[PDB]
Each structure stands twice: as C-alpha cells, then as structure tokens.
Amino acid sequence: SMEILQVALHKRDSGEQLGIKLVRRTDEPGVFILDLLEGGLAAQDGRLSSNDRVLAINGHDLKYGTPELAAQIIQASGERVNLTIARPGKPEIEL
C-alpha cells in the first residue's frame, strides 16, 4: 500500500533552500527523498520523510523526472512550494 500526501513549504526569500536531499535510483523510476537537512524548512515542517517519492511539485509532473529537473523547478518557484508525495510500505513490521 501507499499513502499519497501533499506538503506545502513557504520560501522566505527566492534563494532559500528547502533542505531536502533528492536522489535517483537505477532500479526504478522517479525522484526520491533521501534525507532532510538539519534546521531546514522541510525539517521544520515535519511531514516529509526519507524514502518518500516526489510525484509532482507545483503541478509539474515528476513521476519520471530527475533530481536536476526538480532543482530547476524549485529554484524558479514562487514563495509557495507544494510537493505531492507517495509514501510506500508498512511503518512497523515484526520479523
């Protein structure tokens, strides 16, 4: 199963980073959150997590995107950055 979420962050100035480390994988398409940077907007917001897949940013499709494409979109954004997320899998497993 997967959860689909939407997270809105607000840039204080046009050059502020979001505080996210985005990666590609060789074995599946998409752009994924690896980790959030300390003290950054995303961390402060508290909703995004490692292994989230970024499906879209501000209505721009990222399903088959790249980290560079995400960077272009974010760097050119307005103040509000809305991310649509897919979060797969079980949060707890007994094994």
Side-chain angles (χ1 to χ4, degrees), residues 1-62 64-67 69-95:
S1 66
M2 62 182 45
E3 184 186 0
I4 311 302
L5 308 89
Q6 288 183 77
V7 173
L9 301 178
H10 295 265
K11 287 167 56 179
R12 308 161 196 284
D13 62 83
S14 58
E16 187 176 18
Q17 57 194 46
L18 303 186
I20 307 169
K21 181 172 184 169
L22 290 186
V23 300
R24 70 185 182 207
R25 291 177 183 173
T26 57
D27 66 344
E28 59 173 319
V31 177
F32 301 84
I33 300 182
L34 191 69
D35 199 2
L36 300 187
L37 284 297
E38 189 171 3
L41 289 170
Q44 290 177 55
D45 175 84
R47 291 178 288 181
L48 294 169
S49 187
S50 178
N51 294 302
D52 288 345
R53 183 180 179 179
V54 181
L55 299 177
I57 299 179
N58 289 347
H60 298 263
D61 184 17
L62 282 168
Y64 299 99
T66 65
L69 180 54
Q72 290 172 13
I73 294 161
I74 293 163
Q75 291 174 350
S77 76
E79 64 90 13
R80 183 268 283 138
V81 182
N82 184 64
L83 301 94
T84 304
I85 300 296
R87 180 169 296 162
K90 297 182 182 182
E92 182 180 294
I93 302 179
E94 289 184 345
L95 49 64

Short mmCIF file of all heavy atoms in Angstrom, two decimals, residues 14-80, unseen atoms left out:
data_model
loop_
_atom_site.label_atom_id
_atom_site.label_comp_id
_atom_site.label_asym_id
_atom_site.label_seq_id
_atom_site.Cartn_x
_atom_site.Cartn_y
_atom_site.Cartn_z
N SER A 14 13.62 34.20 -2.32
CA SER A 14 13.65 33.39 -3.55
C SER A 14 14.85 32.50 -3.62
O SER A 14 14.81 31.53 -4.40
CB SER A 14 13.61 34.29 -4.77
OG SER A 14 14.71 35.18 -4.76
N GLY A 15 15.90 32.75 -2.84
CA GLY A 15 17.07 31.90 -2.85
C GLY A 15 17.16 30.91 -1.71
O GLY A 15 18.16 30.22 -1.59
N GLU A 16 16.10 30.75 -0.93
CA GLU A 16 16.14 29.81 0.24
C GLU A 16 16.03 28.41 -0.22
O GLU A 16 15.20 28.10 -1.06
CB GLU A 16 15.05 30.15 1.23
CG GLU A 16 15.17 29.36 2.47
CD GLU A 16 14.18 29.71 3.53
OE1 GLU A 16 13.15 30.34 3.31
OE2 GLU A 16 14.39 29.29 4.71
N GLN A 17 16.81 27.52 0.35
CA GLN A 17 16.64 26.14 0.01
C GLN A 17 15.51 25.55 0.81
O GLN A 17 15.03 26.12 1.81
CB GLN A 17 17.89 25.37 0.30
CG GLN A 17 18.36 25.46 1.72
CD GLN A 17 19.80 24.95 1.83
OE1 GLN A 17 20.66 25.31 1.02
NE2 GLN A 17 20.06 24.14 2.81
N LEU A 18 15.08 24.39 0.37
CA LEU A 18 14.06 23.64 1.09
C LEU A 18 14.65 22.73 2.20
O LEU A 18 13.96 22.42 3.15
CB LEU A 18 13.26 22.79 0.15
CG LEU A 18 12.53 23.50 -0.99
CD1 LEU A 18 11.67 22.54 -1.74
CD2 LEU A 18 11.72 24.63 -0.49
N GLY A 19 15.88 22.33 2.02
CA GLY A 19 16.54 21.44 2.94
C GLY A 19 16.24 19.95 2.70
O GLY A 19 15.94 19.21 3.65
N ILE A 20 16.29 19.53 1.46
CA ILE A 20 15.97 18.18 1.07
C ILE A 20 17.09 17.62 0.23
O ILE A 20 17.60 18.32 -0.66
CB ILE A 20 14.64 18.12 0.25
CG1 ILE A 20 13.51 18.81 1.00
CG2 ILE A 20 14.28 16.74 -0.18
CD1 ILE A 20 12.25 19.01 0.13
N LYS A 21 17.42 16.38 0.43
CA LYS A 21 18.39 15.67 -0.43
C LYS A 21 17.64 14.72 -1.31
O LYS A 21 17.04 13.77 -0.81
CB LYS A 21 19.37 14.95 0.40
CG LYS A 21 20.41 14.21 -0.43
CD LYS A 21 21.48 13.67 0.48
CE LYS A 21 22.54 13.03 -0.24
NZ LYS A 21 23.76 12.70 0.61
N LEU A 22 17.63 14.98 -2.60
CA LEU A 22 16.87 14.23 -3.60
C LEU A 22 17.81 13.32 -4.37
O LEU A 22 18.88 13.76 -4.77
CB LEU A 22 16.16 15.21 -4.60
CG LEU A 22 15.04 16.02 -4.12
CD1 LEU A 22 14.41 16.78 -5.25
CD2 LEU A 22 14.02 15.17 -3.45
N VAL A 23 17.38 12.11 -4.66
CA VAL A 23 18.17 11.12 -5.37
C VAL A 23 17.33 10.42 -6.43
O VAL A 23 16.12 10.34 -6.37
CB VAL A 23 18.80 10.09 -4.40
CG1 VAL A 23 19.68 10.76 -3.44
CG2 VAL A 23 17.71 9.21 -3.78
N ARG A 24 18.04 9.89 -7.41
CA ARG A 24 17.52 8.90 -8.35
C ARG A 24 17.96 7.54 -7.94
O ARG A 24 18.94 7.40 -7.23
CB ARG A 24 17.99 9.23 -9.81
CG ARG A 24 19.44 9.03 -10.13
CD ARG A 24 19.75 9.50 -11.52
NE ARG A 24 21.16 9.25 -11.84
CZ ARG A 24 21.90 9.93 -12.70
NH1 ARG A 24 21.36 10.93 -13.37
NH2 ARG A 24 23.19 9.63 -12.82
N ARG A 25 17.23 6.54 -8.44
CA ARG A 25 17.56 5.16 -8.29
C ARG A 25 17.74 4.52 -9.69
O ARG A 25 17.09 4.86 -10.69
CB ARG A 25 16.40 4.45 -7.60
CG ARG A 25 16.27 4.88 -6.21
CD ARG A 25 15.09 4.27 -5.44
NE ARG A 25 15.01 4.80 -4.07
CZ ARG A 25 14.01 4.59 -3.18
NH1 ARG A 25 12.98 3.77 -3.47
NH2 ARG A 25 14.06 5.18 -1.96
N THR A 26 18.63 3.57 -9.79
CA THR A 26 18.87 2.92 -11.06
C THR A 26 17.84 1.85 -11.32
O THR A 26 17.69 1.46 -12.48
CB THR A 26 20.28 2.31 -11.12
OG1 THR A 26 20.49 1.38 -10.04
CG2 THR A 26 21.32 3.47 -11.03
N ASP A 27 17.18 1.34 -10.27
CA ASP A 27 16.24 0.22 -10.44
C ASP A 27 14.76 0.58 -10.46
O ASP A 27 13.96 -0.32 -10.55
CB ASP A 27 16.44 -0.76 -9.30
CG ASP A 27 16.08 -0.19 -7.97
OD1 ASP A 27 15.92 1.02 -7.76
OD2 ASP A 27 15.95 -1.02 -7.08
N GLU A 28 14.42 1.84 -10.38
CA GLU A 28 13.05 2.24 -10.51
C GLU A 28 13.06 3.70 -10.87
O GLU A 28 13.99 4.41 -10.55
CB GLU A 28 12.20 1.96 -9.30
CG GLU A 28 12.70 2.63 -8.09
CD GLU A 28 11.74 2.51 -6.87
OE1 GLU A 28 10.51 2.61 -7.00
OE2 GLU A 28 12.21 2.32 -5.75
N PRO A 29 12.03 4.11 -11.59
CA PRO A 29 11.99 5.50 -11.99
C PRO A 29 11.61 6.36 -10.80
O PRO A 29 11.03 5.91 -9.80
CB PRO A 29 10.84 5.53 -13.01
CG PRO A 29 9.97 4.37 -12.52
CD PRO A 29 10.88 3.36 -12.10
N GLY A 30 11.83 7.65 -10.98
CA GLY A 30 11.36 8.64 -10.05
C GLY A 30 12.43 9.38 -9.30
O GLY A 30 13.62 9.13 -9.41
N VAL A 31 11.98 10.32 -8.51
CA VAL A 31 12.83 11.13 -7.65
C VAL A 31 12.40 10.91 -6.23
O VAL A 31 11.22 10.95 -5.91
CB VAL A 31 12.70 12.65 -8.04
CG1 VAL A 31 13.46 13.48 -7.20
CG2 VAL A 31 12.97 12.85 -9.50
N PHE A 32 13.37 10.64 -5.36
CA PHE A 32 13.11 10.22 -4.00
C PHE A 32 13.84 11.10 -2.98
O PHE A 32 14.91 11.59 -3.22
CB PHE A 32 13.58 8.78 -3.79
CG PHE A 32 12.90 7.80 -4.71
CD1 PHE A 32 13.34 7.60 -5.98
CD2 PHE A 32 11.75 7.15 -4.32
CE1 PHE A 32 12.67 6.74 -6.87
CE2 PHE A 32 11.08 6.31 -5.17
CZ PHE A 32 11.54 6.14 -6.45
N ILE A 33 13.24 11.28 -1.84
CA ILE A 33 13.88 11.95 -0.70
C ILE A 33 14.78 10.99 -0.02
O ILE A 33 14.35 9.91 0.43
CB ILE A 33 12.84 12.53 0.24
CG1 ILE A 33 11.97 13.56 -0.48
CG2 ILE A 33 13.51 13.11 1.50
CD1 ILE A 33 10.95 14.22 0.35
N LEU A 34 16.05 11.30 0.09
CA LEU A 34 16.98 10.51 0.88
C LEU A 34 16.94 10.89 2.33
O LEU A 34 16.87 10.04 3.21
CB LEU A 34 18.39 10.64 0.31
CG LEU A 34 19.42 9.64 0.91
CD1 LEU A 34 19.13 8.22 0.48
CD2 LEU A 34 20.82 10.04 0.48
N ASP A 35 17.05 12.19 2.60
CA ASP A 35 17.19 12.73 3.95
C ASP A 35 16.86 14.22 3.92
O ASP A 35 16.98 14.83 2.86
CB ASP A 35 18.59 12.49 4.48
CG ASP A 35 18.70 12.57 5.97
OD1 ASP A 35 17.71 12.78 6.67
OD2 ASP A 35 19.84 12.43 6.43
N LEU A 36 16.45 14.79 5.08
CA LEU A 36 16.23 16.18 5.23
C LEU A 36 17.42 16.80 5.96
O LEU A 36 17.99 16.19 6.89
CB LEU A 36 14.99 16.45 6.07
CG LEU A 36 13.69 15.89 5.52
CD1 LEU A 36 12.51 16.39 6.37
CD2 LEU A 36 13.42 16.16 4.09
N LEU A 37 17.77 18.01 5.59
CA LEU A 37 18.89 18.70 6.20
C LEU A 37 18.46 19.33 7.51
O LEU A 37 17.39 19.96 7.62
CB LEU A 37 19.46 19.78 5.25
CG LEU A 37 20.32 19.30 4.08
CD1 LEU A 37 21.59 18.61 4.52
CD2 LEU A 37 19.54 18.36 3.17
N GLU A 38 19.37 19.34 8.44
CA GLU A 38 19.15 19.91 9.73
C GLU A 38 18.71 21.32 9.73
O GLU A 38 19.35 22.10 9.09
CB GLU A 38 20.54 19.89 10.46
CG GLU A 38 20.43 20.25 11.83
CD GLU A 38 21.70 20.03 12.62
OE1 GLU A 38 22.72 19.64 12.03
OE2 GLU A 38 21.67 20.30 13.84
N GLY A 39 17.60 21.65 10.44
CA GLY A 39 17.13 23.01 10.57
C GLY A 39 16.50 23.61 9.35
O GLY A 39 16.14 24.78 9.40
N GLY A 40 16.38 22.88 8.25
CA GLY A 40 15.84 23.45 7.06
C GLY A 40 14.30 23.52 7.09
O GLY A 40 13.65 23.02 7.99
N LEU A 41 13.69 24.18 6.09
CA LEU A 41 12.23 24.32 6.04
C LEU A 41 11.58 22.97 6.12
O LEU A 41 10.59 22.83 6.86
CB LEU A 41 11.76 25.02 4.73
CG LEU A 41 12.03 26.50 4.56
CD1 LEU A 41 11.72 26.92 3.12
CD2 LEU A 41 11.18 27.29 5.53
N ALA A 42 12.05 22.00 5.32
CA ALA A 42 11.36 20.73 5.31
C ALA A 42 11.38 20.06 6.68
O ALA A 42 10.36 19.50 7.11
CB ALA A 42 11.97 19.84 4.23
N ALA A 43 12.52 20.09 7.34
CA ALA A 43 12.63 19.52 8.66
C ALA A 43 11.72 20.24 9.64
O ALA A 43 11.10 19.62 10.51
CB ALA A 43 14.06 19.49 9.13
N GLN A 44 11.67 21.56 9.56
CA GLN A 44 10.82 22.33 10.44
C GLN A 44 9.36 21.96 10.26
O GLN A 44 8.59 21.91 11.22
CB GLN A 44 11.05 23.82 10.26
CG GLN A 44 12.36 24.32 10.76
CD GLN A 44 12.48 25.81 10.46
OE1 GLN A 44 11.62 26.59 10.84
NE2 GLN A 44 13.52 26.17 9.77
N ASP A 45 8.94 21.79 9.01
CA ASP A 45 7.58 21.41 8.70
C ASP A 45 7.23 20.05 9.26
O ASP A 45 6.09 19.87 9.75
CB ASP A 45 7.35 21.51 7.21
CG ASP A 45 6.00 21.03 6.78
OD1 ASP A 45 5.04 21.81 6.85
OD2 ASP A 45 5.89 19.84 6.43
N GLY A 46 8.13 19.09 9.18
CA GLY A 46 7.99 17.80 9.86
C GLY A 46 7.21 16.77 9.14
O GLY A 46 7.06 15.68 9.68
N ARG A 47 6.74 16.97 7.96
CA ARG A 47 5.91 15.99 7.27
C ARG A 47 6.68 15.09 6.31
O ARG A 47 6.32 13.93 6.23
CB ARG A 47 4.76 16.66 6.53
CG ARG A 47 3.75 17.24 7.48
CD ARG A 47 2.64 17.95 6.80
NE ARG A 47 3.08 19.21 6.22
CZ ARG A 47 2.28 20.07 5.58
NH1 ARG A 47 1.01 19.77 5.38
NH2 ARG A 47 2.75 21.21 5.13
N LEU A 48 7.68 15.59 5.62
CA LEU A 48 8.40 14.77 4.63
C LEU A 48 9.35 13.80 5.33
O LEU A 48 9.82 14.07 6.40
CB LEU A 48 9.18 15.69 3.71
CG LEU A 48 8.34 16.57 2.82
CD1 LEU A 48 9.20 17.62 2.16
CD2 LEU A 48 7.60 15.78 1.77
N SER A 49 9.61 12.68 4.68
CA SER A 49 10.43 11.66 5.25
C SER A 49 11.32 10.97 4.21
O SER A 49 11.04 10.93 3.05
CB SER A 49 9.47 10.61 5.84
OG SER A 49 10.12 9.64 6.54
N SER A 50 12.37 10.37 4.71
CA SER A 50 13.24 9.55 3.91
C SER A 50 12.39 8.47 3.24
O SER A 50 11.52 7.88 3.85
CB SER A 50 14.31 8.90 4.81
OG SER A 50 15.18 8.06 4.15
N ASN A 51 12.70 8.22 1.98
CA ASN A 51 12.09 7.25 1.07
C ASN A 51 10.76 7.67 0.46
O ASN A 51 10.22 6.95 -0.36
CB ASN A 51 12.05 5.86 1.65
CG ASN A 51 13.44 5.30 1.82
OD1 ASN A 51 14.17 5.20 0.89
ND2 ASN A 51 13.79 5.00 2.99
N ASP A 52 10.32 8.90 0.75
CA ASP A 52 9.20 9.45 0.03
C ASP A 52 9.53 9.64 -1.42
O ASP A 52 10.63 10.12 -1.75
CB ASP A 52 8.74 10.76 0.63
CG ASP A 52 8.03 10.66 1.97
OD1 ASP A 52 7.62 9.55 2.35
OD2 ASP A 52 7.84 11.72 2.57
N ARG A 53 8.61 9.35 -2.31
CA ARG A 53 8.75 9.64 -3.73
C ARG A 53 8.05 10.95 -4.06
O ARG A 53 6.90 11.14 -3.69
CB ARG A 53 8.15 8.51 -4.58
CG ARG A 53 8.33 8.73 -6.05
CD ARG A 53 7.73 7.59 -6.85
NE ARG A 53 7.87 7.80 -8.26
CZ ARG A 53 7.45 6.92 -9.15
NH1 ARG A 53 6.81 5.83 -8.75
NH2 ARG A 53 7.58 7.15 -10.42
N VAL A 54 8.73 11.84 -4.74
CA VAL A 54 8.12 13.13 -5.15
C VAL A 54 7.44 12.91 -6.49
O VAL A 54 8.10 12.69 -7.49
CB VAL A 54 9.18 14.25 -5.23
CG1 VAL A 54 8.47 15.55 -5.62
CG2 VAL A 54 9.90 14.38 -3.92
N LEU A 55 6.13 12.97 -6.52
CA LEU A 55 5.33 12.79 -7.72
C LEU A 55 5.16 14.06 -8.52
O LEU A 55 5.05 14.00 -9.74
CB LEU A 55 3.95 12.24 -7.37
CG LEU A 55 3.92 10.88 -6.68
CD1 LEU A 55 2.46 10.55 -6.34
CD2 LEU A 55 4.55 9.83 -7.48
N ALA A 56 5.11 15.20 -7.87
CA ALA A 56 4.85 16.49 -8.55
C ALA A 56 5.29 17.60 -7.62
O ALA A 56 5.26 17.44 -6.38
CB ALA A 56 3.39 16.65 -8.89
N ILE A 57 5.66 18.74 -8.21
CA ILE A 57 5.96 19.96 -7.49
C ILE A 57 5.20 21.08 -8.21
O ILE A 57 5.41 21.31 -9.40
CB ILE A 57 7.46 20.28 -7.42
CG1 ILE A 57 8.23 19.18 -6.72
CG2 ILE A 57 7.67 21.61 -6.75
CD1 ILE A 57 9.68 19.34 -6.61
N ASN A 58 4.34 21.75 -7.49
CA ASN A 58 3.60 22.93 -8.06
C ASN A 58 2.87 22.53 -9.35
O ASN A 58 2.78 23.33 -10.26
CB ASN A 58 4.51 24.12 -8.21
CG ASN A 58 4.91 24.74 -6.90
OD1 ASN A 58 4.30 24.43 -5.86
ND2 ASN A 58 5.87 25.62 -6.90
N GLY A 59 2.30 21.33 -9.39
CA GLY A 59 1.57 20.86 -10.55
C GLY A 59 2.45 20.38 -11.69
O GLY A 59 1.87 19.90 -12.67
N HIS A 60 3.75 20.43 -11.57
CA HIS A 60 4.68 19.92 -12.58
C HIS A 60 4.99 18.46 -12.28
O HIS A 60 5.42 18.12 -11.18
CB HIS A 60 5.97 20.73 -12.52
CG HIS A 60 5.80 22.19 -12.83
ND1 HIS A 60 6.04 22.73 -14.07
CD2 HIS A 60 5.36 23.22 -12.10
CE1 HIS A 60 5.82 24.03 -14.06
NE2 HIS A 60 5.36 24.35 -12.89
N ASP A 61 4.74 17.60 -13.24
CA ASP A 61 4.91 16.16 -13.07
C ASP A 61 6.34 15.77 -12.93
O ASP A 61 7.18 16.15 -13.75
CB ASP A 61 4.26 15.47 -14.28
CG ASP A 61 4.26 14.01 -14.20
OD1 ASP A 61 4.44 13.36 -13.22
OD2 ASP A 61 4.11 13.45 -15.29
N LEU A 62 6.64 14.96 -11.93
CA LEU A 62 7.97 14.43 -11.64
C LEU A 62 7.99 12.92 -11.57
O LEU A 62 9.00 12.32 -11.17
CB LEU A 62 8.56 15.04 -10.42
CG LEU A 62 9.14 16.43 -10.60
CD1 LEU A 62 9.43 17.07 -9.26
CD2 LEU A 62 10.31 16.47 -11.46
N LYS A 63 6.91 12.25 -11.97
CA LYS A 63 6.85 10.79 -11.89
C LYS A 63 8.08 10.16 -12.54
O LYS A 63 8.68 9.25 -11.96
CB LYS A 63 5.59 10.28 -12.63
CG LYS A 63 5.33 8.80 -12.45
CD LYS A 63 4.01 8.43 -13.09
N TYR A 64 8.45 10.62 -13.75
CA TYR A 64 9.59 10.11 -14.49
C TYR A 64 10.67 11.18 -14.64
O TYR A 64 11.41 11.24 -15.58
CB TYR A 64 9.13 9.62 -15.89
CG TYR A 64 8.16 8.51 -15.83
CD1 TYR A 64 6.81 8.77 -15.97
CD2 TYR A 64 8.56 7.20 -15.63
CE1 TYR A 64 5.89 7.79 -15.91
CE2 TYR A 64 7.61 6.18 -15.59
CZ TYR A 64 6.31 6.49 -15.73
OH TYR A 64 5.41 5.45 -15.66
N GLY A 65 10.76 12.03 -13.63
CA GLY A 65 11.69 13.09 -13.60
C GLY A 65 13.06 12.71 -13.06
O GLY A 65 13.37 11.57 -12.86
N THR A 66 13.87 13.75 -12.87
CA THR A 66 15.22 13.64 -12.40
C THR A 66 15.48 14.64 -11.28
O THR A 66 14.77 15.64 -11.17
CB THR A 66 16.25 13.92 -13.52
OG1 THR A 66 16.11 15.31 -13.90
CG2 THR A 66 16.06 12.98 -14.68
N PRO A 67 16.53 14.45 -10.46
CA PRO A 67 16.87 15.45 -9.45
C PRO A 67 17.12 16.80 -10.09
O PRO A 67 16.70 17.79 -9.52
CB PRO A 67 18.10 14.82 -8.77
CG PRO A 67 17.84 13.32 -8.86
CD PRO A 67 17.26 13.17 -10.24
N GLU A 68 17.78 16.84 -11.25
CA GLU A 68 18.07 18.13 -11.89
C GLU A 68 16.79 18.85 -12.28
O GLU A 68 16.67 20.07 -12.06
CB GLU A 68 18.95 17.93 -13.10
CG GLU A 68 20.35 18.36 -12.87
N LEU A 69 15.80 18.13 -12.80
CA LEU A 69 14.53 18.75 -13.15
C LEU A 69 13.82 19.30 -11.93
O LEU A 69 13.33 20.42 -11.92
CB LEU A 69 13.63 17.77 -13.89
CG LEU A 69 12.26 18.31 -14.30
CD1 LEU A 69 12.30 19.58 -15.12
CD2 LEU A 69 11.44 17.21 -14.98
N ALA A 70 13.83 18.54 -10.84
CA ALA A 70 13.29 19.06 -9.60
C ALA A 70 14.00 20.34 -9.16
O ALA A 70 13.35 21.28 -8.70
CB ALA A 70 13.39 17.99 -8.52
N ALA A 71 15.33 20.36 -9.23
CA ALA A 71 16.09 21.54 -8.87
C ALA A 71 15.68 22.74 -9.71
O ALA A 71 15.58 23.85 -9.17
CB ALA A 71 17.55 21.27 -9.01
N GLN A 72 15.48 22.57 -11.01
CA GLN A 72 15.10 23.66 -11.86
C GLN A 72 13.77 24.25 -11.42
O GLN A 72 13.60 25.48 -11.36
CB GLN A 72 15.09 23.19 -13.28
CG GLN A 72 16.50 22.92 -13.83
CD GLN A 72 16.50 22.28 -15.20
OE1 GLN A 72 15.46 22.24 -15.89
NE2 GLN A 72 17.67 21.78 -15.62
N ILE A 73 12.81 23.36 -11.16
CA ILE A 73 11.50 23.80 -10.74
C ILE A 73 11.57 24.56 -9.42
O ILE A 73 10.98 25.65 -9.25
CB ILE A 73 10.54 22.61 -10.65
CG1 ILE A 73 10.28 22.00 -12.04
CG2 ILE A 73 9.23 23.02 -10.02
CD1 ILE A 73 9.74 20.60 -11.98
N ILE A 74 12.26 24.00 -8.45
CA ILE A 74 12.34 24.63 -7.14
C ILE A 74 13.06 25.96 -7.17
O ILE A 74 12.64 26.95 -6.54
CB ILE A 74 12.96 23.61 -6.12
CG1 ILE A 74 12.03 22.43 -5.88
CG2 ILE A 74 13.31 24.33 -4.83
CD1 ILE A 74 12.67 21.20 -5.24
N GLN A 75 14.18 26.03 -7.91
CA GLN A 75 14.96 27.27 -7.94
C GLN A 75 14.17 28.42 -8.61
O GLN A 75 14.47 29.57 -8.36
CB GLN A 75 16.27 27.06 -8.63
CG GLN A 75 17.18 26.18 -7.81
CD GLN A 75 18.48 25.80 -8.55
OE1 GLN A 75 18.62 26.06 -9.76
NE2 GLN A 75 19.41 25.19 -7.83
N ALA A 76 13.26 28.10 -9.50
CA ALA A 76 12.47 29.08 -10.23
C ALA A 76 11.15 29.32 -9.59
O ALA A 76 10.36 30.07 -10.18
CB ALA A 76 12.27 28.66 -11.69
N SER A 77 10.80 28.69 -8.49
CA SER A 77 9.49 28.78 -7.90
C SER A 77 9.19 30.15 -7.41
O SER A 77 10.05 31.01 -7.25
CB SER A 77 9.36 27.77 -6.78
OG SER A 77 10.02 28.17 -5.64
N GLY A 78 7.92 30.35 -7.10
CA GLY A 78 7.46 31.39 -6.22
C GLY A 78 7.66 31.00 -4.77
O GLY A 78 8.31 30.01 -4.45
N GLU A 79 7.05 31.76 -3.88
CA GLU A 79 7.21 31.52 -2.46
C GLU A 79 6.66 30.18 -2.01
O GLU A 79 7.23 29.54 -1.13
CB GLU A 79 6.60 32.65 -1.66
CG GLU A 79 5.16 32.82 -1.78
CD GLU A 79 4.31 32.04 -0.76
OE1 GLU A 79 4.85 31.52 0.24
OE2 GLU A 79 3.06 31.99 -0.96
N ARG A 80 5.57 29.73 -2.57
CA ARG A 80 4.93 28.51 -2.12
C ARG A 80 5.37 27.33 -2.98
O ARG A 80 5.15 27.40 -4.21
CB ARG A 80 3.42 28.66 -2.15
CG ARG A 80 2.65 27.50 -1.64
CD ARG A 80 2.31 26.58 -2.73
NE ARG A 80 1.20 27.06 -3.55
CZ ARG A 80 1.14 26.99 -4.86
NH1 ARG A 80 2.19 26.55 -5.55
NH2 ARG A 80 0.06 27.46 -5.47
#
